[PDB]
Design a binder for this molecule. Sequence first.
Ligand SMILES: [K+]
Ligand SMILES: [K+]
Ligand SMILES: [K+]
Ligand SMILES: [K+]
Ligand SMILES: [K+]
Ligand SMILES: [K+]
Lengths: 91, 91, 91, 91
Amino acid sequence: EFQVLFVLTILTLISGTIFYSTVEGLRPIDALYFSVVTLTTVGDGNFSPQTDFGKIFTILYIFIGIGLVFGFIHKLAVNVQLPSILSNLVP
Amino acid sequence: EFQVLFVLTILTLISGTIFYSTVEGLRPIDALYFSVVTLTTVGDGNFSPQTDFGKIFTILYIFIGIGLVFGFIHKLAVNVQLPSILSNLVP
Amino acid sequence: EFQVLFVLTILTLISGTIFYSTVEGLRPIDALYFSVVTLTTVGDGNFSPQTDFGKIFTILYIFIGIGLVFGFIHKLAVNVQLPSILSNLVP
Amino acid sequence: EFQVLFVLTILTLISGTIFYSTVEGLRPIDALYFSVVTLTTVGDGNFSPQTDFGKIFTILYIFIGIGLVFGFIHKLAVNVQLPSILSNLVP
Ligand SMILES: [K+]
Ligand SMILES: [K+]
Ligand SMILES: [K+]
Ligand SMILES: [K+]
Ligand SMILES: [K+]
Ligand SMILES: [K+]
């Protein structure tokens, strides 16, 4: 479950990285950063897509990627972080 | 259920598109982009409504649209994306 | 329930409006806008508190106000918007 | 439960404060502010990490810290704010 969500999240982020570096001309690390803050809904305070293609893609990317990204975060904290802490709270 | 949430989300986004292009003078695609990043809570790092009418509308728009948009995303991932993946995980 | 959450949300937003217009010098409508986009986690793409007092207050404001604001939005969509739609879907 | 989430949230915020003030050169209060708005997903409208180290760290920080921060907010409102209000609604 966690493994599949991990892989799915990775593939989604790879797609955004390729898209923004190609269409919006961002350096790969910047494209990845933008993809991450966008899908986690944090948002970037400096960059907004400048092309209409980038704006349309971002709209679709958000609706399709948000659910998955948060599902991964949800399990990452409940089935991976909680135990390491919950069991670690046992005297 | 998903169909109704889809239509409801579309109508809400259309309202924002019309509002921002008219009152804030944004190009339709920019008004739509702003409506989407606002209701999904991602936020836009460059534009903020400049008119008091735009600020008041955005406040109301956020409170009324956020629940619906996320309800749609919630079902889009649970009743449309999960299956295509869950069933696809069957050897 | 909805009435109490409504009043509680109003009081919280009033506090932010007074704080930002006084300490950060924002026009009341701008202070209210900033309080709303901050507590709904949308964020503002132009303004960030400039004083240390404003930064500390915003940090505390976020942790204390986010839960309430979303609890209100949660009920506003489930116990006020859903019915008007759910019952409206009855032929 | 609430105490542990409180401590865990504090430690996470301390880590971000140290990281951003050291690598991104922010004043401690600004590093803390950025860490808070980033993990609560509000986002900052002015600052984005400028170094590649800062961008990579922020990406990892977001995925690891978001779940915890919201778990704390979740309990802070349900097991600390609700009662003080729920019991306060008793004539
Ligand atoms: K900005
Ligand atoms: K700017
Ligand atoms: K957000
Ligand atoms: K933002
Ligand atoms: K945001
Ligand atoms: K922003």
